[PDB]
Amino acid sequence: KFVAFLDVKHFSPEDLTVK
């Protein structure tokens, strides 16, 4: 969840891991 390094973007199509 929240994988965009934006910390303000709901979800992302480039999810790699839990991070």
Q: Output the six-digit token pair for 14.
A: 């480039």
Contact by Cβ (8 Å): 19, 3:
yes
Report the alpha-carbon angle 13-16-18, nearest 5: 110
- H-type alpha helices, 1-19: none
Q: What is the DSSP letter of 4?
A: S
**HSE-CB of 19 using CA atoms within 13 angstroms:** 12
Contact yes or no for 4/15 (Cβ under 8 A) = no
Give the separation between CA 19 and CA 13, rounded to whole angstroms: 14
The approach used to solve this structure was: NMR
Left if phi > 0, otherwise alpha if psi is -120 to 50, otherwise beta: which for 4? alpha
| C-beta separation of 4 from 14 below 8 A | yes
Residues 6+ apart with CB under 8 A from 1: 11, 18
